[PDB]
């Protein structure tokens, strides 16, 4: 288990991801590459008509070479990882992954384009993979309200045998106007 490391960055827009290599602390930015569906919604109902499509601009082969976890706004994805939101809130009081119910990534739609939501009630959506558990790093206070960063340490097991313990710090910049992802973490290299 490494010392505690830190990661922080201001987030890009709805059409982009950051990909974090937890081992090196480095990240790369990249657009969502998946095919898009423009959906017109009849009032927060899941009933919609398809009004447009743009083809995919790439495939998973185009993804950055080395990454463990990834963020799109507040959505989270792992590179073949399983996540458990533990009950621990002090990252200094934990140095190994506990037993429990670890959650794999599952199919999910993300919002890639929200520019025509006000004018038309249309959203560009892409079908991708998200990790539902890690997604809990921010808790909604209800719509139209700033979310709150949860204090819990998240445990992450990777297929490759590495692991991490992550505690989120911030989802906004200092002004509180711009999105961000900030956390402290310990990396546990497969021995």
TrEMBL record:
Pfam families: HmuY (PF14064). It comes from the Bacteria. InterPro entries: HmuY. The keyword Manganese does not apply. Keywords: Signal. The keyword Isomerase does not apply. This is Heme-binding protein HmuY. It comes from Prevotella intermedia.
């Amino acid at each position: 288990t490494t010392q505690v490391k830190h990661f922080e960055t201001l987030m890009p827009g709805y059409d982009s991801w950051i990909y974090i290599d937890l081992e090196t602390g480095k990240f790369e930015q990249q657009a969502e590459l998946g095919k898009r569906e423009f959906r017109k919604y009849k009032m927060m109902d899941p009933n919609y008509e398809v009004v447009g499509t743009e083809p995919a601009k790439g495939t998973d082969a185009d993804l950055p070479k080395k990454w463990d976890i990834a963020f799109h706004i507040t959505d989270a994805r792992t590179n073949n990882g399983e996540v458990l939101m533990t009950g621990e809130t002090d990252l200094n009081k934990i140095n190994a992954l506990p037993a429990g119910n670890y959650v794999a990534d599952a199919p999910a739609d993300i919002v890639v384009d929200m520019s025509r939501m006000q004018s038309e009630g249309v959203l560009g959506m892409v079908k991708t993979m998200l990790n539902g558990e890690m997604g809990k790093w921010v808790k909604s206070n209800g719509m139209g309200k700033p979310k709150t960063v949860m204090g819990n340490v998240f445990a992450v097991k990777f297929k490759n045998g590495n692991a991490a313990l992550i505690k989120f710090k911030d989802n906004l910049d200092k002004t509180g106007k711009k999105k961000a992802v900030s956390f402290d973490y310990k990396f546990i290299k497969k021995a």
